[PDB]
From Swiss-Prot:
Belongs to the helicase family. Dicer subfamily. Residues 101-213 form the PAZ domain. The gene is DICER1. Double-stranded RNA (dsRNA) endoribonuclease playing a central role in short dsRNA-mediated post-transcriptional gene silencing. Cleaves naturally occurring long dsRNAs and short hairpin pre-microRNAs (miRNA) into fragments of twenty-one to twenty-three nucleotides with 3' overhang of two nucleotides, producing respectively short interfering RNAs (siRNA) and mature microRNAs. SiRNAs and miRNAs serve as guide to direct the RNA-induced silencing complex (RISC) to complementary RNAs to degrade them or prevent their translation. It is linked to Pleuropulmonary blastoma: A rare pediatric intrathoracic neoplasm. The tumor arises from the lung, pleura, or both, and appears to be purely mesenchymal in phenotype. It lacks malignant epithelial elements, a feature that distinguishes it from the classic adult-type pulmonary blastoma. It arises during fetal lung development and is often part of an inherited cancer syndrome. The tumor contain both epithelial and mesenchymal cells. Early in tumorigenesis, cysts form in lung airspaces, and these cysts are lined with benign-appearing epithelium. Transmembrane segments: none annotated. The lineage of its organism: Eukaryota, Metazoa, Chordata, Craniata, Vertebrata. It comes from Homo sapiens. It comes from the Eukaryota. It is found in: Cytoplasm; Cytoplasm, Perinuclear region. Component of the RISC loading complex (RLC), or micro-RNA (miRNA) loading complex (miRLC), which is composed of DICER1, AGO2 and TARBP2; DICER1 and TARBP2 are required to process precursor miRNAs (pre-miRNAs) to mature miRNAs and then load them onto AGO2. Note that the trimeric RLC/miRLC is also referred to as RISC. Interacts with DHX9, AGO1, PIWIL1 and PRKRA. Associates with the 60S ribosome. Interacts with BCDIN3D. Interacts with AGO2, TARBP2, EIF6, MOV10 and RPL7A (60S ribosome subunit); they form a large RNA-induced silencing complex (RISC). Changing F158A: 2-fold decrease in activity. This is Endoribonuclease Dicer.
Length: 234
RNA sequence: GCGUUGGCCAACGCUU
RNA sequence: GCGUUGGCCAACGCUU
């Protein structure tokens, strides 16, 4: 077990959206053994982020069960989180050990009525990547919750004239009925990003959106994974 | 916000 | 002249 550790040395200056530092969260990516030890920054949306590989536990033997789990999750990172070195990349937490609960949680793989309403918990949208459930018809889309607009509801004026309200937008286009008209809205930014990081409207309805098991922060961390691995392998 | 073609500037690379 | 990233406008397409 090695840890792919992350800190932003040089954050983005006041010139031009906020900031999202990888060290504000403890959960990260790491690399399993059976491999020889390599030698010892990627430039993100959150600014310049320096990267450090360290050894954590050498000479550990892990169960074939847990090995299957870590490899399954490895492929889940690369086929599912991104779309396209070393053995399995894995989640680490309290940097301490391996997170088996996290992996098992991910591996766990919607009726709203007036009699059966939709409940809005704010926490669920705080660190979140979401999907419109309404249009997975081609290659489901994933968005970080950029903002939560608490002064807004689905009955708010739609940004385009052809529609007066959001509820009306989703009703006319997607034939979508909302059981919560009091829910706040979510500004979102797209998760699909650049592959080589080595060199330097959009409002959604919580009720129409599924939440992704990979927290937005860790997503943002994962987007580094290829650019890291490019010169690690090389 | 994204995409796409389309000009109008920046910057290093080719090219001359 | 080309290429490449990078902003700054045009236009239809997605999206909201």
């Amino acid at each position: 077990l090695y840890v792919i550790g992350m800190v932003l040395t040089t954050p983005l200056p006041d010139e031009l959206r906020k900031l999202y530092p990888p060290e504000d969260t403890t959960r990260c990516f790491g690399i399993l053994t059976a491999k020889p030890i390599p030698q010892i920054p990627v430039y993100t949306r959150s600014g310049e982020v320096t990267i450090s590989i360290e050894l954590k536990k050498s000479g550990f033997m892990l169960s074939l069960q847990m090995l299957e789990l870590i490899t399954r999750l490895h492929q889940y990172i690369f086929s599912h989180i991104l779309r396209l070195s070393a053995y399995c990349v894995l989640p680490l937490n309290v940097t301490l050990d391996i997170d088996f609960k996290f992996m098992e949680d991910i591996e766990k793989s919607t009726k709203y009525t007036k009699e059966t309403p939709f409940v809005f918990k704010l926490e669920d949208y705080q660190d979140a990547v979401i999907i419109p459930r309404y249009r997975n018809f081609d290659q489901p889309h994933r968005f970080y919750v950029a903002d939560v607009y608490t002064d807004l509801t689905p009955l708010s004026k739609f940004p385009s004239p052809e529609y007066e309200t959001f509820a009306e937008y989703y009703k006319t286009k997607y034939n979508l009925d909302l059981t919560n008209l009091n829910q706040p809205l979510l500004d979102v930014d797209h998760t699909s990003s650049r592959l080589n990081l080595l060199t330097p409207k959009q409002i959604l309805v919580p009720e129409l959106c599924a939440i992704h098991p990979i927290p937005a922060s860790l997503w943002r961390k994962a987007v580094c994974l290829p650019s890291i691995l490019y010169r690690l392998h090389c």
